[model samples]
Target: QVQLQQSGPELVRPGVSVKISCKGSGYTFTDYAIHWVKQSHAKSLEWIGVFSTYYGNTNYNQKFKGRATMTVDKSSSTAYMELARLTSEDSAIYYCARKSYYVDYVDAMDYWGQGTSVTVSSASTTPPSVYPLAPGSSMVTLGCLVKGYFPEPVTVTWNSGSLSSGVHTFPAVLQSDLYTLSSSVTVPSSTWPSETVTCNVAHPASSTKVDKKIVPRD
Candidate 1:
């Protein structure tokens, strides 16, 4: 059994930013990796990236390229993320994801933090809602049509950032030492394209992870 608890709530102004943490328990901190997620007040969920407790490596979504930085405190079994540049649109619930899978090894998320909510609201507004996610229309979908790749497969998720969990699926293929696996996801509308979407691949033989992130835009 493993557990991850987040610490601190951040209140940022129009041009400022903040840092938050994810504390881990019931597992070997160095043996696993932590993932961070973002959800706007009334938007879809965004895949931030992963941080390794052992190797201290990270895989961040390109959309979060300049805003998200992942770090871990090995001694305390905690993961930290520092997000920069404050804006009302950046206001949302931030989560530090816990998984048994290590940085080099990949697995599904079986457990999660209670989540720390942050907002860019003025000091007068209350913090985030005490709920998993706010409800809204998600144009995101998880259907891909790819070609010219090896038998080794890949994983994809379709979530509308509506706050509900995304869906995961794997294609059948033969594992290989150096197989080039890929995916093609088509979002029907421009709104869906703006929502956060991701594709991840993990090889059983190694602890390496490959991921691709897309941000919704019109």
Candidate 2:
């Protein structure tokens, strides 16, 4: 029943350092160790470091030996990581996981953080393409497709009358030279009389917003 929550996306200068925090709950925070994972430009997972809260022991990745530092707050049950000497190479998403141990070797990290990202520069996000996923079904699925967005973060929300909208964002994916994000909301058969299904998008790069609506039937 452990939970890990992380900080939101960040915008920093090319050389400025940035710190990301992970808050743990639902159990004794310091009972298990925490591990940090780094995912860079290529969209691949890499281990940055892991630390033991009980014993103050740490193992770090060679790449982040001098660049990343890990710390924990026992009173608040929060774990923090700071990446210094930032460059384009350091502009990536980071996640903290609660490690479950057995003995000499690590077993697994059961709980995971929501994740945070650091972007060196800002750009405008492209408007999403909203459409119905499958037609003529008892339960309908609506999808919002966002492509060519920058800095690796995107949010999508659905809007319909009495439909109980929910926003679900898929992981950031690299598409050739840019990033793409997709989110979906399912419409129960009972609420099929809506005029339009609106897809709202939010990204770190752009503040000006727009909602794309897909027709329920076409």
Candidate 3:
């Protein structure tokens, strides 16, 4: 399967620069084009630029001509973007998308890299509050809410092994300069009383890991 593994979240101060990479696998990297897109906090997507790895050619949006630079390493099948002159406005989730070309035009982005969050701030880091909500009408469904995190890049997982057949995670929302997100998993209701399920949260900003366990009542 095609995959684009992106670098981790970054927390940098103003007036500095940050560089992020997206490495491609399971396909011929240079055969296609890679484009960069930015989603500012809770705003819409903006196209930053596109780079052709094989030809070493790049086309940038006029708005990001001086603020953003796109480059690629054919040897490693990786695409990189560097954002300079950082400010709070530059704090956003940037994504590298694989652009497929058709006859005389470009097609939709076929694949995308998991977004890399860049926080351009000098504020202190804040850890998240992890809460595992009790089962309501649907006994099989479990919900986990993660709230009040800064420099947003958190991972949520269930105690159950790597098998993620019924797991769903929502995108983080920004409020009052903090972030909130949630995840849910489905398990057999019969095992609720006898077994214990845990919601694991990993917050990188504060270097904290929280495990909240839940056992349904009889």
Candidate 4:
């Protein structure tokens, strides 16, 4: 798997934009697409959009279309994303993702960088997270939603690691300006009344697509 290492802290003036880069380690930058996602909310966050590292193409959550921009540097095996029109609300951590393209469409990513943190002494921000999807009949349901951004992606999974070995099915891709990714699964209510399923977010980036096991909770 490729490792994504993003550059650190960026300081900028309000109303201005800062462009940051993530260097791809041990992977092909051009073969796969580099994804950009913003962090919002608390320790748990949401996604912003999907960006092309080969080209400065961007598909942000409709709400962020006018803000986030993604690009790449073939020479340096680097991927980039820029947040524009900085404001107090744009303060948050940004991550570069390595994506997997299936049937010519981006389905998920592999590795995520050590996410760069941007402060909004001037600009604010949004993040990504895993949540409890709407309830299901006899089984438990979970969801994955990347807020604040784009590239219309879907949630193909519901559980992480061993918890989802035999029965999980494809999650539904919510329709909208953002990554309409949502997943659901049914488990015996007695599978443990106080039971829970862990999940993570994956996408494509400069080096590798699909992130490692992320044990995000609801």
Give the best candidate by TM-score: 3
Candidate 3 lDDT at 27 equals: 96
lDDT by residue for model 3 (27-132), tens: 9999988989999946589989888878978899999758888888899999899999999888889999999864458466779999998888887689999987
Candidate 2, residue 186: lDDT: 74
The regions of model 4 sitting more than 4 angstroms off are: 101-106, 122-218
Indicate the residue-level lDDT of 2 in model 4: 77
In candidate 3, what residue range of length 10 has the lowest lDDT sum?
101-110
- The digit string of per-residue lDDT tens for model 1 on 62-178 reads 987578888878888888998888787787788877656455565656678887767564443211111111113424454333222322222333332232243434343323312
Q: What is the C-alpha RMSD of each candidate to the true structure, in Å?
A: 18.9, 5.1, 3.7, 13.0
Candidate 2 lDDT tens digits, 1-218: 77999998987776778889998889898898899998774569998889887777888998775788888888898888888877777777889998986465856877789788777653444543333343453666777777775655565667733344554668868665367777777766575545466777666465535577665455
Which candidate tops lDDT?
A: 3
Model 4 TM-score? 0.50
Looking at model 3, the pairs that clash are: none
Instruction: Tell me the number of clashing residue pairs for each predicted model.
Output: 9, 0, 0, 54
Location of the lowest summed lDDT over 10 successive residues in candidate 4: 205-214
> How many angstroms is residue 153 displaced in model 3 relative to the true structure, after the best TM-score fit?
2.5
Q: Model 4: number of clashes? A: 54
Q: Estimate each model's TM-score.
A: 0.53, 0.67, 0.75, 0.50
